[PDB]
Design a protein around this ligand. Structure first.
Ligand code: SAH
Length: 379
């Protein structure tokens, strides 16, 4: 299996070009008001949903006087870490003061706008970011039921077609994700222009491909570039793969396979791939050292990992995904699944990657997610 030549300069020069355009991708992709104008509104909607759930669970937070002691709401033990984050959000919104175990009400009034009016206005005002706001209310309106076990967050999202459509749109269409996928397209296109042509394929493996939020852009891109390629789309979920096998049959350069990031690679995967793509999946594993070491062993020596990772917490993301067991699997010293790029570099370097870089910019959104590239060998 002779694969393409992949000079280090092609990677580093393409990444530098993409990196310097980060703020351009944020503006073009309609994310340039997200941190300062959209996120306070989605955070407000989360908080309102929380207040409603608390009232439903017997906490009179809406009517409580200043300094009133509030009892903790009921919830399943598995939600302890999440609910500490939830109470944190209420404190950041200045509705409560926390003092260790003691929760007390502030003088700040709860908003009088309903969550229905909040959503309606946000959907009308910010239609490009609709998907995550709809998802926020899908679980948010059932928040008391979820944290007590009467409903399950994973079932709510994926058990209905409406939820499945929203979450696909979140991963593919919402600027908060599409910006950096589009930037990865630019990186890869500039990369391929710098490759020798030997007739041999570029071998690309996507981990955690899930709903195909990245995949749906990569395949037309590789189709249009027309250089030999084998694209292996993988995920832990066999249903998501089976669906993708149908959806993406159009493309003849495709392989589809169930692959667990946490598993040691079978011999057939060892040193096989030029590029591993991984969008917001590696953080969901138990141990980042183990996962990134596994990924390293699947890379050819001339290859690299391209992470697309959320590097800063966003309240609506925690509010929704924090309901899911998959958000709390870390057991490697992290206190949250998501980590800043500096931590990712620490892990990546410690398991043998030779060069780590990431996107940055002056816009605040450039800190929310990053492309993080990690070369298997040191240049
Ligand atoms: N151990 C593991 N190995 C592989 N994929 C995993 C995994 N743990 C979680 N995942 C997958 O990682 C994805 C995280 S969702 C992030 C969005 C995703 N790339 C998309 O476009 O849909 C999900 O598809 C989930 O099934």
């Amino acid at each position: 299996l002779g694969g393409s030549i992949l000079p280090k300069s092609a990677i580093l020069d393409a990444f530098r070009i993409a990196k310097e355009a980060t703020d351009d991708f944020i503006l073009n992709g309609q994310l340039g008001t997200y941190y300062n104008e959209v996120m306070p509104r989605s955070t407000e909607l989360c908080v309102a949903h929380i207040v409603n759930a608390f009232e439903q669970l017997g906490c009179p937070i809406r009517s409580a006087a200043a300094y009133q002691r509030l009892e903790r709401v009921p919830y399943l033990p598995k939600h302890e870490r999440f609910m500490n984050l939830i109470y944190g959000l209420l404190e950041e919104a200045r509705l409560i003061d926390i003092n260790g175990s003691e929760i007390t009400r502030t003088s700040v009034p709860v908003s009088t706008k309903s969550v229905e009016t909040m959503l309606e206005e946000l959907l009308h005002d910010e239609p490009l970011h609709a998907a995550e706001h709809k998802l926020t209310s899908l679980t948010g309106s059932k928040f008391a039921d979820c944290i007590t076990g009467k409903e399950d967050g994973l079932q709510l999202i994926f058990g209905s077609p409406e939820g499945r459509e929203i979450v696909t749109d979140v991963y593919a269409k919402s600027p908060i994700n599409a910006v950096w996928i589009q930037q990865a397209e630019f990186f890869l296109e500039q990369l391929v222009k710098r490759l020798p042509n030997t007739g041999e394929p570029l071998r690309i493996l996507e981990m955690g491909a899930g709903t195909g939020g990245t995949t749906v852009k990569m395949l037309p891109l590789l189709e249009r570039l027309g250089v030999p390629v084998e694209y292996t789309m993988t995920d832990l979920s066999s249903s998501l793969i089976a669906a993708a096998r149908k959806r993406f049959k159009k493309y003849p350069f495709m392989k589809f396979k169930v692959v667990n990031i946490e598993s040691p690679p079978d011999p057939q995967l060892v040193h096989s791939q030029h590029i591993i793509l991984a969008t917001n999946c590696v953080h969901a594993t138990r141990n980042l050292e183990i996962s990134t070491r596994n990924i390293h062993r699947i890379l050819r020596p001339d290859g690299f990992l391209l992470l697309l990772e959320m590097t800063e917490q966003v309240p609506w993301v925690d509010f929704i995904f924090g309901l899911l067991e998959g958000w709390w699997l870390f057991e490697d010293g992290r206190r949250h699944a998501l980590q800043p790029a500096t931590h990712w570099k620490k892990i990546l370097t410690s398991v043998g990657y030779g060069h780590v870089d990431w996107t940055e910019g002056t816009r605040p959104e450039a800190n929310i997610q990053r492309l993080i590239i990690a070369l298997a060998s040191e240049p």
